[PDB]
Design a protein around this ligand. Structure first.
Ligand SMILES: Nc1nc2c(ncn2[C@@H]2O[C@H](COP(=O)(O)OP(=O)(O)O)[C@@H](O)[C@H]2O)c(=O)[nH]1
Ligand SMILES: [Mg+2]
Length: 660
C-alpha cells in the first residue's frame, strides 16, 4: 500500500559530478514528495507513483558498487552544474549510463548562480557526450533574477513567488519569451515525430499534436536511449524541482519498460527473469547496513514474485534458508513496516544473518537462480596502517573485525616481519575509500600509509630437502628433523599437505607442529618476501630425540625445510594479470593505446560505443599505481576506466629481475 501497480513504480538514481547538487536535489525531492541520508533506498510518492531513490555513495564513479547499483535501478536523473554544463565525471557517469543501458533525464541545476548557462550544458552534451539533448524548458531570467520556467512541451510558464518552494504560479508565457518558446516547441515536435508516425502525419499537414502524444513520444525516445530530455532549475532556491518530479513520472521507465534481468541456473542455462509478481521469488541483496534500531538491514530489489513478511527465502549463493522477520521501507523522515515487497520494488529485510551483498534470494521451493556470478575476486592490493596509541590500536580492530560484516570482500593480516596491520582490497580505487571510511565513521585519529600490491611465489621443479632444528636453548635440548618433497601444483590449486611418515619416524603429536611451521614459512618467499602458493608438500621422513623433541622444535624444522625447498626449487614470481575497461573519446585512441603498453600489456580488443571507444586490456596492476590522474592527463579529463582480477601469470625473464 498504496495499492501496488508495476506501471507506477519509478526506480531511479540521481547521478552527478561532485558539487553539482546531487544531495540538495535529492533532499528537495524528499521535501516536495513528503508534503501530505543514510538509507540505501528511500521511497516517496508523487502524483500517483512510487519513486524509489537509490543512494550511490561515490565521490568517484569508477568502482564495483556501480555494476551492482545499475542492475538495481531502472532510470536516472543526471544533474549538471549549470556554470560548467558538463565536467569530467559528468562525462564519466554518462559513459556508465550508456554502457549499462539506462534511460535518463538531465537537470541543469544552479540556474540562480553566477555563470549559469542552459546552453553551455546542451552544447556540451552534444559535443562531448553525443547525447541528443532536447530542450524541455526555457528559463525566465538570468542568474540573480532567474524567476520562472517555461514548459515548451505544453507552452505554459511558472513563476516563483519566493525561494522557499512555497509560491508557484502557472502563467501564460511572457510576451518577450513567446517566439523563443515557439521555436523550441516546434523543435520538440520535430523530435517527437521521429518516434511516432501519427505525429509525423500531423507535422506535414500543419497540425498541433495533443500533449499526450508528445509526452508518449518523448517517453519512448528516452527509454530506448535515443534522446535526453533536459530540465532546469535551482534546487537551492526551490524552482523547477516539482517539474523535475513531473518529468520522472512522464519520461523515466517503470520496471515494465526495460529488458528483464538475466540469471543463471546451476545447470548453466542463462535465463531471463520477468517482473511478474505471482511468479517465483527472485531478489538481490544490494547493500547491508548495520542499523541502530533493528540491526542488520539487508536491502533488496525484487525482480520476480513477491517477498513476504515472516516467510523463508533461500540464499542460492550461500546454501541456506533465512527467516525474513520484518519488511521495511525508508521514507525521508520515517520507517514504514510493510507486509510485502513485490516484483519491481525495493526495500529492506530484517532477519537475515548470513546474506551479504550480491547474494540472490529465492522462494524456498522456487527455481534456484543466481543473479551475480559466483566469485570473490582475489584480494590484490595490500597496505600498511598506523593507528598510533592504545586508544586507537584497540579501537581500530573494533571496526575491522566488525566493519567486514558490511563489506566482506576485503581481508586483513600482519606482515611476517613487521608486527602490525595490513589491509587488502582489489584495485587502487577500492582502497582509496576504506581508510577514510573509518577515521571518520569511528573517530579514529590515526596515521596514513601508502599502498603496495600482492604478488605471490611458487616453485617450478620438484625438490627434496630437509629441516633440522637442533639446539641447546632455554637450559634444554631442542630436536626436530623433517624431510619433505615439494612439488608444483597447477596454477590456482592452492596448497596440499601429504603425510607419508612410516611408523613413529616422526612421532604423531608433532605432525601438526611441522604443518604449522610450513604455512608460517610459506608467508615469505625468497626472491621478494611474498606468500607462496600452488605447492604440494609431502612429509616422508625425519627423526626425533626422546627428551629433547618438542612442538616448537618441529615447527621451526618445518619452517626451515619449506624455506629451503622454495629457494632450491627454481622459484618464480606470480603477478596478477588483471582486466581494465578504459573508456575514452575516440580522439585519444592511440595515446592510451601506447601508454597502457608502457606499463606491460597485451591489448585484448577495443570495441566502439557512443561517440567514443572501449579499450579492454590486460595489465599487471603493479605498473598501474595511480592510473586515475594519468589516464585523465592524456585524455583531457574525459576518460574513465574500470579494473578487476582475472588470473596469475609467471612473469617473463627481465620482469623477474627488476623486482630485485
Ligand atoms: N548556487 C546554488 N547552489 C547550489 C544549488 N544546488 C546545490 N547548491 C550548492 O552546492 C553545494 C554542493 O551541493 P551538494 O548537493 O551537496 O552537491 P553534491 O556533491 O552533488 O551532493 C552546496 O553548497 C549546495 O548548497 C543551486 O541551485 N544554486
Ligand atoms: Mg552529496
Amino acid at each position: 500500500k498504496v495499492e501496488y501497480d508495476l506501471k507506477r513504480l519509478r526506480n531511479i538514481v540521481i547521478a552527478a559530478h561532485i558539487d553539482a547538487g546531487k544531495t540538495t536535489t535529492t533532499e528537495r525531492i524528499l521535501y516536495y514528495t513528503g508534503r501530505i541520508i543514510t538509507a540505501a533506498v528511500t521511497t516517496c510518492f508523487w502524483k500517483d507513483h512510487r519513486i524509489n531513490i537509490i543512494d550511490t555513495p561515490g565521490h568517484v564513479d569508477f568502482t564495483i558498487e556501480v555494476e551492482r547499483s545499475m542492475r538495481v535501478l531502472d532510470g536516472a536523473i543526471v544533474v549538471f552544474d549549470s556554470s560548467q554544463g558538463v565536467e569530467p565525471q559528468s562525462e564519466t557517469v554518462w559513459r556508465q549510463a550508456e554502457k549499462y543501458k539506462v534511460p535518463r533525464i538531465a537537470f541543469a541545476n544552479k540556474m540562480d548562480k553566477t555563470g549559469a548557462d542552459l546552453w553551455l550544458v546542451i552544447r556540451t552534451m552534444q559535443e562531448r557526450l553525443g547525447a541528443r539533448p532536447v530542450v524541455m524548458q526555457l528559463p525566465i531570467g538570468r542568474e540573480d533574477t532567474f524567476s520562472g520556467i517555461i514548459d515548451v512541451l505544453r507552452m505554459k510558464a511558472y513563476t516563483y513567488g519566493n525561494d522557499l518552494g512555497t509560491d508557484i504560479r502557472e502563467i501564460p508565457i511572457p510576451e518577450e519569451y513567446l517566439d523563443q518558446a515557439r521555436e523550441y516547441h516546434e523543435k520538440l515536435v520535430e523530435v517527437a515525430a521521429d518516434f511516432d508516425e501519427n505525429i509525423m502525419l500531423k507535422y506535414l499537414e500543419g497540425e498541433e499534436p495533443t500533449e499526450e502524444e508528445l509526452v508518449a513520444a518523448i517517453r519512448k525516445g528516452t527509454i530506448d536511449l535515443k534522446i535526453t530530455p533536459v530540465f532546469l532549475g535551482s534546487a537551492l532556491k526551490n524552482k523547477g524541482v516539482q517539474l523535475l518530479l513531473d518529468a520522472v513520472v512522464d519520461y523515466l521507465p517503470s520496471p515494465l519498460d526495460i529488458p528483464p534481468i538475466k540469471g543463471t541456473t546451476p545447470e548453466g542455462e542463462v535465463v531471463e527473469i520477468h517482473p511478474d509478481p505471482n511468479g517465483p521469488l527472485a531478489a538481490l541483496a544490494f547493500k547491508i547496513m548495520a542499523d541502530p534500531y533493528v540491526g542488520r538491514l539487508t536491502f533488496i530489489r525484487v525482480y520476480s514474485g513477491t517477498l513476504t513478511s515472516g516467510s523463508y527465502v533461500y540464499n542460492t549463493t550461500k546454501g541456506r534458508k533465512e527467516r525474513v522477520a520484518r519488511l521495511l521501507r525508508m521514507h525521508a523522515n520515517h520507517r514504514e513496516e510493510v507486509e510485502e515487497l513485490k516484483a519491481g520494488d525495493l526495500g529492506a529485510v530484517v532477519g537475515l544473518k548470513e546474506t551479504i551483498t550480491g547474494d540472490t534470494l529465492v522462494g524456498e521451493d522456487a527455481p534456484r537462480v543466481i543473479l551475480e556470478s559466483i566469485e570473490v575476486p582475489e584480494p590484490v592490493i595490500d597496505v600498511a596502517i598506523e593507528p598510533k596509541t592504545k586508544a586507537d590500536q584497540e579501537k581500530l580492530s573494533q571496526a575491522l573485525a566488525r566493519l567486514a560484516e558490511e563489506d566482506p570482500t576485503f581481508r586483513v593480516s600482519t606482515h611476517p616481519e613487521t608486527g602490525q596491520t595490513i589491509i587488502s582490497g582489489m584495485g587502487e580505487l577500492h582502497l582509496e575509500i576504506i581508510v577514510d571510511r573509518l577515521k571518520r565513521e569511528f573517530k579514529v585519529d590515526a596515521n596514513v600509509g601508502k599502498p603496495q600490491v600482492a604478488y605471490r611465489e611458487t616453485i617450478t621443479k620438484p625438490v627434496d630437502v630437509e629441516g633440522k632444528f637442533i639446539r641447546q636453548t632455554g637450559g634444554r635440548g631442542q630436536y626436530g628433523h623433517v624431510k619433505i618433497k615439494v612439488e608444483p601444483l597447477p596454477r590456482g590449486s592452492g596448497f596440499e599437505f601429504v603425510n607419508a611418515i612410516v611408523g613413529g619416524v616422526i612421532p604423531k603429536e608433532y605432525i601438526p607442529a611441522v604443518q604449522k611451521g610450513i604455512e608460517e614459512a610459506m608467508q615469505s618467499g625468497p626472491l621478494i618476501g611474498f606468500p607462496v602458493v600452488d605447492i604440494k608438500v609431502t612429509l616422508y621422513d625425519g627423526s626425533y630425540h626422546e627428551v629433547d623433541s618438542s612442538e616448537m622444535a618441529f615447527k621451526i624444522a618445518g619452517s626451515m625445510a619449506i624455506k629451503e625447498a622454495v629457494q632450491k626449487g627454481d622459484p618464480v614470481i606470480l603477478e596478477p594479470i588483471m582486466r581494465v575497461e578504459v573508456t575514452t573519446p575516440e580522439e585519444y585512441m592511440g595515446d592510451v593505446i601506447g601508454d597502457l603498453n608502457a606499463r606491460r600489456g597485451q591489448i585484448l580488443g577495443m570495441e566502439p560505443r557512443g561517440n567514443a571507444q572501449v579499450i579492454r586490456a590486460f595489465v599487471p596492476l603493479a605498473e598501474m599505481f595511480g592510473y586515475a590522474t594519468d589516464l585523465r592527463s592524456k585524455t583531457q579529463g574525459r576518460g574513465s576506466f574500470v579494473m578487476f582480477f582475472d588470473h596469475y601469470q609467471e612473469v617473463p625473464k627481465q620482469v623477474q629481475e627488476k623486482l630485485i
